[PDB]
């Protein structure tokens, strides 16, 4: 029944709005200029950063590259909490074995972080601090190794992904499908996850058929993006393994350590 599939799509969209404060809609409204409120403060170099460090930050002894990296860590932690709340709204999720819920999040959250970062990005930079800051791609890419190469891959994906022109309604279901991946390592009860995902995939297919009538390729392209994201996150984790090993001033946030731990 397509009726139930549209109701499911709407439920996920509504939960998505509850769980994620800065939506792609609200982000694109800021990136362009729909709003009249104080545009975000633009950070494009060391000088712009030091003065904006009060409009983006709601110590001061660590170098810039480290400070910005810690910032990315704090946002990702907040995002993990948002994603966890969203996951719990997906029909069937909370009824899964609790250990499997943890496993699904452990392997899923960073794929979702990449996905949702794109919503806050254009070719030129990323919105931060709930939209009150805008840090340029060029500034982030210029951060000393290895940190510049840690930032850039997120923009590389966002450019490709944003070309697909998904909206928040599309994204709500896309994210749900990713979280309910029955082939994450170490899952105990695969069938119930696969059954939920199969229904979510049907919901996604119908959503894209109705919402993007003129782009028949979209569903198949999103399935491949789910595959790409696994390789993309593997690289993220590795590069982060190198950072915690090579930078003596790396306080890896406990939640992130917990997620990265034994991620293979």
């Amino acid at each position: 029944e397509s009726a139930d599939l549209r109701a499911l799509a709407k439920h996920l969209y509504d939960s998505y709005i509850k769980s994620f404060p800065l939506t792609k809609a609200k982000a694109r409204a800021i990136l362009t200029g729909k709003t009249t409120d104080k545009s975000p403060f633009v950070i494009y170099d060391m000088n712009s950063l030091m003065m904006g460090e009060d409009k983006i930050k709601f110590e001061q002894s660590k170098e810039v590259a480290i400070r910005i990296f810690q910032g990315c860590q704090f946002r990702s932690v907040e995002a993990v909490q948002e994603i966890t709340e969203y996951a719990k709204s997906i029909p069937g999720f909370v009824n899964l074995d609790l250990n499997d819920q943890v496993t699904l999040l452990k392997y899923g959250v960073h794929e979702i972080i990449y996905t949702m970062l794109a919503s806050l990005m254009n070719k030129d930079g990323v919105l931060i601090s709930e939209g009150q800051g805008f840090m340029t791609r060029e500034f982030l890419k210029s951060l000393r190794k290895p940190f510049g190469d840690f930032m850039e891959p997120k923009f590389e994906f966002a450019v490709k992904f944003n070309a697909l022109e998904l909206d928040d309604s599309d994204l709500a279901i896309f994210i749900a499908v990713i979280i309910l991946s029955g082939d994450r390592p170490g899952l105990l009860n695969v069938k119930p996850i696969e059954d939920i995902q199969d229904n979510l995939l049907q919901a996604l297919e119908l959503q894209l058929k109705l919402n993007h009538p003129e782009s028949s390729q979209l569903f198949a392209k999103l399935l491949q993006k789910m595959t790409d994201l696994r390789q993309i996150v593997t690289e993220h984790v590795q590069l982060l393994q190198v950072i915690k090993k090579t930078e003596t001033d790396m306080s890896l946030h406990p939640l992130l350590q917990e997620i990265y731990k034994d991620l293979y």
Binding site: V80, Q81, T84, K88, V94, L98, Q101, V102, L105, K106, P254, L255, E258, I259, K261, D262
Partner: peptide, 11 residues
């Protein structure tokens, strides 16, 4: 492991 995720998952 996963002390934090566990408590986040349980309201």
């Amino acid at each position: 492991r996963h002390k934090i995720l566990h408590r986040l998952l349980q309201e």
